[PDB]
Amino acid sequence: MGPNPMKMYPIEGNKSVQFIKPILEKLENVEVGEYSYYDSKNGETFDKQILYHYPILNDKLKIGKFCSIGPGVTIIMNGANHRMDGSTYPFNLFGNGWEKHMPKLDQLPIKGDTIIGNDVWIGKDVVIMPGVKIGDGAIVAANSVVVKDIAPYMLAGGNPANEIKQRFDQDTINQLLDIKWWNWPIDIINENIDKILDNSIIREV
Amino acid sequence: MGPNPMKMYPIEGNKSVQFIKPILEKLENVEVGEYSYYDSKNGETFDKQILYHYPILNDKLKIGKFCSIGPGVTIIMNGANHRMDGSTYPFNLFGNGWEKHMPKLDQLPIKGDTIIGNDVWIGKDVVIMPGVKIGDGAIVAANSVVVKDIAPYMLAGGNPANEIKQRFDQDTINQLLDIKWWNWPIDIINENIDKILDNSIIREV
Amino acid sequence: MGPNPMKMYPIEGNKSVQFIKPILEKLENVEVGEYSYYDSKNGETFDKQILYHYPILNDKLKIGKFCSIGPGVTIIMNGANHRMDGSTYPFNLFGNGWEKHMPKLDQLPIKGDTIIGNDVWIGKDVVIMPGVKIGDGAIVAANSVVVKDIAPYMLAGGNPANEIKQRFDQDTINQLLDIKWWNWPIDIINENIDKILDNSIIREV
Numbered sequence: 334m335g336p337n338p339m340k341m342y343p344i345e346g347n348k349s350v351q352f353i354k355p356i357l358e359k360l361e362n363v364e365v366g367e368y369s370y371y372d373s374k375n376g377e378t379f380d381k382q383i384l385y386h387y388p389i390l391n392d393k394l395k396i397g398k399f400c401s402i403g404p405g406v407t408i409i410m411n412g413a414n415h416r417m418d419g420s421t422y423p424f425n426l427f428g429n430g431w432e433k434h435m436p437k438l439d440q441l442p443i444k445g446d447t448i449i450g451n452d453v454w455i456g457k458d459v460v461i462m463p464g465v466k467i468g469d470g471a472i473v474a475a476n477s478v479v480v481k482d483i484a485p486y487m488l489a490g491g492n493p494a495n496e497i498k499q500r501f502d503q504d505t506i507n508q509l510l511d512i513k514w515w516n517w518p519i520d521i522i523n524e525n526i527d528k529i530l531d532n533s534i535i536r537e538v
Numbered sequence: 539m540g541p542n543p544m545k546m547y548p549i550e551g552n553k554s555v556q557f558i559k560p561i562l563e564k565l566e567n568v569e570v571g572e573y574s575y576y577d578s579k580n581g582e583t584f585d586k587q588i589l590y591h592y593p594i595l596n597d598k599l600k601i602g603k604f605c606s607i608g609p610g611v612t613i614i615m616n617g618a619n620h621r622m623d624g625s626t627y628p629f630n631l632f633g634n635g636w637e638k639h640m641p642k643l644d645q646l647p648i649k650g651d652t653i654i655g656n657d658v659w660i661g662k663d664v665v666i667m668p669g670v671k672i673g674d675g676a677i678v679a680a681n682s683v684v685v686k687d688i689a690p691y692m693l694a695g696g697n698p699a700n701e702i703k704q705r706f707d708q709d710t711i712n713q714l715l716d717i718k719w720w721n722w723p724i725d726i727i728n729e730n731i732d733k734i735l736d737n738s739i740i741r742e743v
Numbered sequence: 744m745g746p747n748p749m750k751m752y753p754i755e756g757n758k759s760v761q762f763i764k765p766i767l768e769k770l771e772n773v774e775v776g777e778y779s780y781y782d783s784k785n786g787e788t789f790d791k792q793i794l795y796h797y798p799i800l801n802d803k804l805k806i807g808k809f810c811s812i813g814p815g816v817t818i819i820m821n822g823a824n825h826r827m828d829g830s831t832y833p834f835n836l837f838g839n840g841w842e843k844h845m846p847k848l849d850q851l852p853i854k855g856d857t858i859i860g861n862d863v864w865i866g867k868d869v870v871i872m873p874g875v876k877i878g879d880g881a882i883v884a885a886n887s888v889v890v891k892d893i894a895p896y897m898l899a900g901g902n903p904a905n906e907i908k909q910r911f912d913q914d915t916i917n918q919l920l921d922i923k924w925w926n927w928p929i930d931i932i933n934e935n936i937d938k939i940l941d942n943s944i945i946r947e948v
């Protein structure tokens with residue numbers, strides 16, 4: 334029961350809402366969660382929202398299951414960082430003799446992989462910078478610029494985004510993180526969708 | 539004197555500057571002032587700058603008059619709020635049996651109506667979140683994101699937007715909030731525009 | 744050795760990378776450094792990125808040499824401020840008798856000149872407000888909004904953009920702000936690019 338997570342467009346007669354996993358499974362250094370979707374801004378597929386991702390750099394992008402991603406969201410990978418131990422001007426880029434000054438792989442600054450947990454909600458037009466980690470259950474307010482990691486089930490926003498408030502009490506959150514319902518076989522998930530939606534899934538255990 | 543506030547396009551040989559009342563009164567749950575205008579960013583009419591406004595949630599939008607609205611300014615109504623008591627994933631939205639979980643009105647969080655006073659100036663590309671009240675005579679810096687209320691004659695800006703400073707001494711402010719020149723027939727505002735542009739209407743009155 | 748600074752497009756066959764100077768020289772009240780380039784977002788020339796710049800207001804824009812300006816960057820000049828001693832509403836703009844109230848120049852808030860130092864890197868979609876100074880060797884994080892000055896060799900970011908951390912120890916900077924390699928006769932620079940790229944230039948000079 335439910336949609337088919339392998340369909341590019343699960344909603345029939347709708348080419349705005351798309352399932353990410355299908356779109357990005359041909360990609361290298363990219364992992365996506367089963368039911369995570371993207372609500373297109375101008376009909377663009379989400380692969381076009383991932384900027385500066387070069388396999389050479391080998392930075393990997395991970396997105397968990399059941400993620401609600403708003404339109405315009407932009408994931409900036411490590412491709413666009415400039416060498417900064419000195420002048421940030423890319424001489425090597427203009428040839429005519431400057432090609433020799435090509436940077437060395439271990440000379441480019443790499444901030445790590447971008448990892449997004451499960452059940453995360455990302456508002457529209459959010460910009461996620463490199464090497465950022467967003468824990469499960471997090472909610473990132475629209476038009477935010479995520480520069481540092483976000484703790485699970487935290488409400489974060491602004492530019493630079495900051496943790497505004499905890500979604501639930503420490504306890505509940507610990508429970509939830511431990512429970513990990515997004516990691517259940519669909520049959521079960523399908524049966525408690527309501528409790529998952531009202532957070533009582535905890536109490537039945 | 540002055541243009542007829544009922545004219546969509548006040549200035550001739552110009553489909554860029556538009557009086558909003560005319561345009562937006564073709565809408566449910568929207569109240570617009572008389573001389574409030576919108577400076578188009580690419581020709582688009584302002585009604586298109588209002589997102590997720592669904593009559594069913596019954597949230598309304600009100601805009602005083604003599605408001606200067608920069609281009610690209612965006613208003614965000616309650617139509618995009620996800621349920622948050624539990625998981626933020628819109629199961630119901632995918633059908634195929636998940637429809638049953640469609641959230642009940644009393645379950646979606648509605649932050650309230652969004653109210654923007656008179657003589658309010660909003661910079662370009664500003665984003666306004668739901669249920670936010672903005673004060674009479676306030677200036678909102680370009681590129682701000684308004685998540686909380688702003689007091690009258692306050693200068694605010696940032697992401698999130700913060701009150702930066704007051705525009706005039708409390709005294710002067712208390713007065714203008716008293717006089718409310720914007721509520722006067724135009725035949726009158728007409729012969730004081732000068733005492734209004736230089737804040738001297740406070741002494742005539 | 745190196746590309747010709749008088750070429751709009753220094754990279755044969757490429758219409759995205761463009762040297763700012765040969766493009767903006769035709770404009771009055773604009774000063775640009777020789778090797779400063781702009782990475783076009785959608786193929787547009789940089790001049791489209793400078794807004795509300797009226798010669799009459801006589802404000803000027805200044806960009807040093809060897810600057811790496813990113814795509815989408817937007818520089819806003821002073822033709823965008825409204826009078827603020829009274830109402831922020833532009834009565835004169837609508838004419839039909841209101842032209843009377845055109846504001847005199849000394850009445851318009853003019854914040855001053857915008858000056859971008861040398862060897863400065865500005866990330867994508869950074870918006871620069873009027874009358875700001877950005878020091879040499881500074882670095883501005885993408886999606887920032889510059890509302891105030893920025894000391895040299897400072898890494899800044901946010902909205903409002905804030906200085907985050909000095910790129911190097913004072914020592915280095917002082918010598919750096921002293922050597923002024925961007926001011927050297929090219930051919931000398933051609934022989935020290937490597938030294939400039941890793942900051943070892945200090946040691947020699």
Ligand SMILES: CC(=O)SCCNC(=O)CCNC(=O)[C@H](O)C(C)(C)COP(=O)(O)OP(=O)(O)OC[C@H]1O[C@@H](n2cnc3c(N)ncnc32)[C@H](O)[C@@H]1OP(=O)(O)O
Nearest residue numbers: 372401402403455456457474475490491497618685686698
């Ligand atoms: C695929 C899809 O996503 S579908 C639709 C597209 N979606 C969007 O754009 C979703 C965005 N929704 C939001 O951003 C919403 O602002 C609040 C994130 C979900 C979103 O929090 P709420 O539960 O309602 O909290 P609330 O309104 O009370 O805000 C709490 C505090 O945070 C502040 N706040 C709100 N937004 C921000 C922000 N971006 N940065 C910092 N603080 C913020 C408030 O000012 C308030 O201040 P206070 O605690 O000092 O009094």
Ligand SMILES: CC(=O)SCCNC(=O)CCNC(=O)[C@H](O)C(C)(C)COP(=O)(O)OP(=O)(O)OC[C@H]1O[C@@H](n2cnc3c(N)ncnc32)[C@H](O)[C@@H]1OP(=O)(O)O
Nearest residue numbers: 577606607608660661662679680695696702823890891903
């Ligand atoms: C339809 C139409 O509106 S027509 C044109 C389109 N218009 C626009 O984009 C309008 C935008 N104009 C602005 O945003 C302008 O920045 C200042 C809002 C109107 C706009 O204030 P000013 O009177 O000139 O104040 P000033 O320059 O001195 O700034 C005061 C302080 O606020 C800070 N500031 C400026 N912008 C911001 C901001 N967005 N957030 C926080 N602080 C800010 C300054 O850094 C300064 O700091 P300090 O007090 O610690 O020293």
Ligand SMILES: CC(=O)SCCNC(=O)CCNC(=O)[C@H](O)C(C)(C)COP(=O)(O)OP(=O)(O)OC[C@H]1O[C@@H](n2cnc3c(N)ncnc32)[C@H](O)[C@@H]1OP(=O)(O)O
Nearest residue numbers: 413480481493782811812813865866867884885900901907
């Ligand atoms: C022409 C061209 O430009 S080519 C490509 C187009 N380019 C772009 O978009 C370039 C943008 N690159 C960046 O913005 C990059 O974020 C960091 C500016 C260059 C860019 O700094 P780094 O050396 O790597 O520093 P680092 O990652 O450690 O960040 C340091 C601190 O600043 C914070 N930070 C990062 N971005 C921001 C920001 N915008 N505002 C405030 N703080 C920020 C971090 O959270 C961190 O916090 P902490 O000190 O408390 O722990």
